Amino acid sequence: QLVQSGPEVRKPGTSVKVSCKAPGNTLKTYDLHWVRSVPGQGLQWMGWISHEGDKKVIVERFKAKVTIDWDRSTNTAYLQLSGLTSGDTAVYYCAKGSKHRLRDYALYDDDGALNWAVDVDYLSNLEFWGQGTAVTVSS
Amino acid sequence: ENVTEEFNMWKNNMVEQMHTDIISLWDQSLKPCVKLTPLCVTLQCTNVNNIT
Numbered sequence: 001q002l003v004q005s006g007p008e009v010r011k012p013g014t015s016v017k018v019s020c021k022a023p024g025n026t027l028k029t030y031d032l033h034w035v036r037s038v039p040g041q042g043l044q045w046m047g048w049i050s051h052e053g054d055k056k057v058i059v060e061r062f063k064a065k066v067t068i069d070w071d072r073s074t075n076t077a078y079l080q081l082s083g084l085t086s087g088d089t090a091v092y093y094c095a096k097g098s099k100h101r102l103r104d105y106a107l108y109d110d111d112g113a114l115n116w117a118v119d120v121d122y123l124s125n126l127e128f129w130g131q132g133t134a135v136t137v138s139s
Numbered sequence: 140e141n142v143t144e145e146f147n148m149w150k151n152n153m154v155e156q157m158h159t160d161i162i163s164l165w166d167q168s169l170k171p172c173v174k175l176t177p178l179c180v181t182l183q184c185t186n187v188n189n190i191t
């Protein structure tokens with residue numbers, strides 16, 4: 001299982017922080033995802049930062065106001081929100097999953113080396129999910 | 140006729156010269172041949188199947 005920070009209430013305008021912790025260090029090879037769940041509006045994908053540390057994809061719709069960090073030493077996921085508007089009043093879930101790092105077009109060299117490779121990675125699944133943190137913004 | 144000459148198979152230089160020769164031809168025949176560096180790759184190998 002996973003642990004998330006407790007429910008939070010924030011006055012709009014300032015920032016909020018959410019922490020997702022794994023028990024000890026048993027989930028390190030798996031990649032990290034953040035999701036949002038506006039009630040009655042389905043679920044949205046906040047973004048992900050992978051597990052090797054080579055990706056930081058965050059959806060552009062939330063790129064400006066949302067940051068996702070990972071502390072290796074404590075093995076802790078950090079989610080920072082800045083705008084904190086009425087639309088952010090919802091439940092944020094931390095998920096641990098796995099991807100498929102396929103190798104697409106790659107330029108081998110004459111001698112047989114690997115000059116470069118786009119090797120774009122594909123999302124496979126999100127096995128482990130946090131208990132969910134409710135963030136309430138009230139004016 | 141009537142000729143006696145010393146011989147020494149072990150101090151003979153002909154063997155050394157011809158060894159150097161054979162080495163030279165062996166290398167020269169390999170110079171205009173296909174390079175095989177791209178073979179040094181990980182090999183997924185299994186045992187092989189109608190074998191004594």
Ligand SMILES: *[C@@H]1O[C@H](CO)[C@@H](O[C@@H]2O[C@H](CO)[C@@H](O[C@@H]3O[C@H](CO[C@H]4O[C@H](CO)[C@@H](O)[C@H](O)[C@@H]4O)[C@@H](O)[C@H](O[C@H]4O[C@H](CO)[C@@H](O)[C@H](O)[C@@H]4O[C@H]4O[C@H](CO)[C@@H](O)[C@H](O)[C@@H]4O)[C@@H]3O)[C@H](O)[C@H]2NC(C)=O)[C@H](O)[C@H]1NC(C)=O
Pocket residue numbers: 029030031098099100101102103181182183
């Ligand atoms: C000759 O070149 C080809 C190039 O295509 C190459 O084949 C590809 O090799 C790569 C390297 O392993 C394969 O990438 C892995 O793929 C698996 C999924 O494989 C299954 O599904 C495919 C179809 O998509 C099937 O064809 C295949 O047979 C399998 O059924 C991924 O799951 C792997 O992801 C792991 O590694 C990633 C990094 O590489 C991680 O980011 C990822 O999170 C996964 O982590 C794994 O390891 C963790 C520890 O490191 C562990 O904790 C996790 O639980 C997890 O197990 C990986 O991306 C690729 O599938 C191959 N096929 C194709 C079409 O690209 C040949 O191997 C090569 N021949 C040689 C070198 O001899």
Ligand SMILES: *[C@@H]1O[C@H](CO)[C@@H](O[C@@H]2O[C@H](CO)[C@@H](O[C@@H]3O[C@H](CO[C@H]4O[C@H](CO)[C@@H](O)[C@H](O)[C@@H]4O)[C@@H](O)[C@H](O[C@H]4O[C@H](CO)[C@@H](O)[C@H](O)[C@@H]4O)[C@@H]3O)[C@H](O)[C@H]2NC(C)=O)[C@H](O)[C@H]1NC(C)=O
Pocket residue numbers: 052053054055056057070
């Ligand atoms: C030899 O090969 C190894 C692995 O095979 C390489 O090691 C990785 O190299 C990649 C670069 O391709 C590194 O990825 C980059 O890491 C940066 C580290 O940033 C730290 O600080 C920021 C805050 O500023 C943190 O947010 C972050 O988590 C890190 O703690 C990132 O900043 C980079 O992010 C940028 O690029 C990504 C996409 O790549 C974008 O999404 C981001 O927005 C940002 O623009 C990037 O992720 C990776 O860290 C290396 N890992 C290790 C273990 O070394 C070697 O680089 C390679 N060496 C050579 C010479 O080829």
